[PDB]
């Protein structure tokens, strides 16, 4: 019979902090056990990883450190585990000992992260090409990402199938898909992924161990909860997705909006067909903000995670990752709990370094770009001053930058009574990141004064240099020169 154990069968790429040669593929158990020896384990799809780090954080929280002066007891228990440096393998095999038969992805009953009843009531298989990302599904245009005619498709290996699976449970097309009659009701319509189009932020250490431990969000006191893959019950598609105060409900793993089924190859080496289909009809609000994402409120008062953006340079978001101030956005709770000195770790904070997964795509089923971003290491009153410099910097920076946008745009119009904005921003941000990074490290940057609280209008000189680099050849005819300079004067501040 086809079987594929996630704990045993290798699928997580792993490079240790040692040797730094030949990264080896490991299963989930072997990875989770040798965490202290390996530096990191990765998968090529940032969405897949964006949910992966959630799965590992939840699992290691359920093994150690759940439910629970609750705050001081959590930070104390937290301090012991961070100081000890190694989880005992017997508690991992004891945590898996409760769900030993449940981690098969092709299990006859209760398949991993799947719905077994979906195989019936679904006359047409979606196909591997409809599940995996970057693979042209049935009606898509075939042009890019390898041509796949949806006729005799080469079956994915199971590991990559797990990656694309995790992606679909996270980000998933909100469009209508294959229909499933459930007790007479067939609405082939499918909802959107729970965190579709946001960049997840997981902090890192020197190995996966302490990183995964800092990944654990603080569970507020409430009802004990359990994940979708930890549910003894098989979900009923109709009804309300009941709320969940437990950490498995705020780690977005209590139930996923989509539902995938993978048809196994006789050996279990490949996936041959797939079914992606709706699991719930009426959408309900999930309690509490996702600790990983940066939230932000725009007029109308809507609290929403800032949608990723391929165009934006990442560094500005990193500034938001800091607070005790509020710059118009709510922000991320895990970062707030995890990194300030009120917490408890002594030194790991000095060497921790933040990582970002951002899959920016349509509000529908269209997709444009994903990206990872292992940004350096960043961390009271003295610290408050360093953050204050960072804010007053990112502020002056984008503010004058967009003012240069309006400038360029308007300029070209009033001239002609625009091609300048695109190239303007390209050189601008490309030239602007290193100047910012010099400001944060308090290094000397021309037009900027080291160790002065004020911004120093350095970005004025950068934007002016970029502006002249773009508009140079068109300040030629006297009229256009008049408009272009009279709008360049505004960047002088």
């Amino acid at each position: 019979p086809p079987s594929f154990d996630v704990t045993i069968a290798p699928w997580l790429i792993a490079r240790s902090r040692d040797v730094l040669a030949a990264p080896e593929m490991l299963g989930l158990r072997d990875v989770l056990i040798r965490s202290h020896e390996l530096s990191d384990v990765e998968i090529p799809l940032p969405p897949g990883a964006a949910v992966l780090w959630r799965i590992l954080a939840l699992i290691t929280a359920r093994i150690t450190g759940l439910d629970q002066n609750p705050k001081r007891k959590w930070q104390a228990r937290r301090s012991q585990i961070l100081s000890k440096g190694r989880l005992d393998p017997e508690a991992v095999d004891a945590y898996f000992a409760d769900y030993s038969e449940r981690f098969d992805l092709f299990h006859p009953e209760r398949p991993w992260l799947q719905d077994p009843r979906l195989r019936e009531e679904c006359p047409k298989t979606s196909g591997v090409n409809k599940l995996a990302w970057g693979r042209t599904a049935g009606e898509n245009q075939v042009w890019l990402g390898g041509h796949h005619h949806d006729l005799d498709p080469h079956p994915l290996d199971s590991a990559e199938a797990v990656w694309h699976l995790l992606a679909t449970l996270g980000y998933g097309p909100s469009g209508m898909c294959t229909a499933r009659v459930v007790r007479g009701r067939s609405e082939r319509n499918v909802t959107a992924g729970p965190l579709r189009g946001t960049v997840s932020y997981h902090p890192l250490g020197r190995t996966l161990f302490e990183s995964l431990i800092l990944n654990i969000p603080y569970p507020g006191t409430g009802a004990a909860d359990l994940a979708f893959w930890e549910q003894p019950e098989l979900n009923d598609p109709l009804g309300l997705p009941e709320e969940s105060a437990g950490l498995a409900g705020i780690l977005r793993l209590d139930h996923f909006r989509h539902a995938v089924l993978l048809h196994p190859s006789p050996d279990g080496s490949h996936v041959v067909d797939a079914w992606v289909t709706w699991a719930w009809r009426e959408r309900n609000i999930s309690p509490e903000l996702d600790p990983y994402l940066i939230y932000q409120t725009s007029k109308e008062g809507r609290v929403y995670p800032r949608p990723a953006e391929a165009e934006r340079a990442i560094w500005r978001d990193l500034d938001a990752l800091l607070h005790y101030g509020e710059d118009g956005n709510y922000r991320p709770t895990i970062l707030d709990n995890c990194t300030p000195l009120a917490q408890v770790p002594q030194e790991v904070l000095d060497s921790l370094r933040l990582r970002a997964f951002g899959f920016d795509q349509d509000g529908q089923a269209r997709d444009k770009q994903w990206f990872t971003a292992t940004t350096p290491a960043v961390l009271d009153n003295e610290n408050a001053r360093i953050v204050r410099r960072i804010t007053l910097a990112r502020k002056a920076a984008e503010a004058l930058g967009r003012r240069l946008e309006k400038a360029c745009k308007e300029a070209w119009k009033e001239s002609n009574s625009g091609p300048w904005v695109q190239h303007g921003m390209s050189r601008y941000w490309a030239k602007a990141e290193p100047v910012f990074w010099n400001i944060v490290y308090d290094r000397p940057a021309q037009g900027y004064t080291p160790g002065m609280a004020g911004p120093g209008n350095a970005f004025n000189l950068v934007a002016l240099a970029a502006y002249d680099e773009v508009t140079g050849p068109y300040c030629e005819r006297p009229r256009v020169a008049k408009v272009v300079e009279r709008h360049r004067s505004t960047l002088f501040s």
């Binding site: 041509h147 005619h149 002609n416 009574s417 625009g418 091609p419 190239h423 050849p473 068109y474």
Partner: protein, 260 residues
């Protein structure tokens, strides 16, 4: 054996291809922005003349039919470089207004005010074709003859169709240089990495500049490359480019003959 062609085709005030906005595509090169016509656009035009004139050498010479499913040969052994202007070019805005024919008891409140961008210049075009893969894939050497000869003349004659009804950009290349090279393909693009200065025209000056670059590269690498070039001017000699030919089809004939 690679046969590559360099041309210095000029285009009057035109907007053959354009961005998502109205402005033409531009490559900032040598510190000076310079208009370009992307490679795929000109290549698609070439594909239509070659296939029209031929009445599967098109899936061989060019990579793969756009409307056909991949037939295990997606590559083509033809490499079109993006044409770019020899000199720096400011995008020249053309303000235009659509006229309303029926007139009310008011005057001239025209139908549509707008401004569209256009540009003109002497594009340095370039392409190479890998004969060896073409022979190995097509089989018959004569099919290779018609494919390369007919492809070459097509390379010269065609011009993309974009905003052409408003601007008649039809033209013939001023300089063509086909160099049958056995070592490796070489583009003379860096000859124009320093945009030429203006006010007197560029055809002659660009010709002689390309001559200097050909002289020097041939100096660094003396080779058995069979060369030849044809121009619409008889006033200036370009010894580095090979023997002169009276006309373009004569040249193409001599070089296809030279390949076999």
């Amino acid at each position: 054996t690679f046969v590559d062609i360099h041309a210095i085709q000029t285009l009057p005030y035109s907007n053959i291809n354009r961005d998502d906005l109205g402005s033409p595509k531009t490559v900032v090169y040598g510190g000076k922005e310079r208009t370009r016509v992307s490679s795929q656009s000109w290549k698609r035009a070439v594909r239509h003349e070659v296939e029209a004139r031929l009445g599967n050498v098109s899936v061989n010479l060019f990579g793969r039919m756009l409307a056909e499913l991949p037939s295990t040969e997606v590559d083509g052994a033809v490499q079109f470089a993006h044409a770019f202007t020899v000199h720096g070019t400011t995008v020249e805005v053309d303000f235009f207004t659509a006229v309303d024919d029926i007139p009310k008891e008011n005057d001239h409140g025209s139908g549509h005010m707008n401004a569209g961008q256009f540009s003109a210049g002497t594009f340095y075009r370039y392409a190479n074709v890998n004969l060896d893969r073409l022979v190995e894939n097509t089989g018959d050497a004569q099919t290779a003859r018609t494919a390369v000869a007919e492809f070459l003349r097509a390379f010269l004659s065609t011009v993309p169709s974009g905003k052409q009804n408003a601007t008649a950009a039809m033209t013939l290349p001023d300089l063509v240089h086909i160099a049958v090279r056995f070592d490796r393909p070489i583009s003379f693009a860096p000859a124009f990495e320093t945009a030429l200065y203006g006010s007197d025209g560029y055809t002659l000056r660009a010709c002689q500049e390309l001559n200097n670059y050909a002289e020097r590269l041939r100096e660094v690498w003396p080779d058995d490359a069979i060369r030849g070039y044809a121009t619409v001017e008889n006033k200036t000699d370009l010894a580095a480019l090979g023997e002169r030919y009276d006309s373009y089809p004569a040249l193409i004939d001599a070089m296809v003959a030279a390949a076999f």
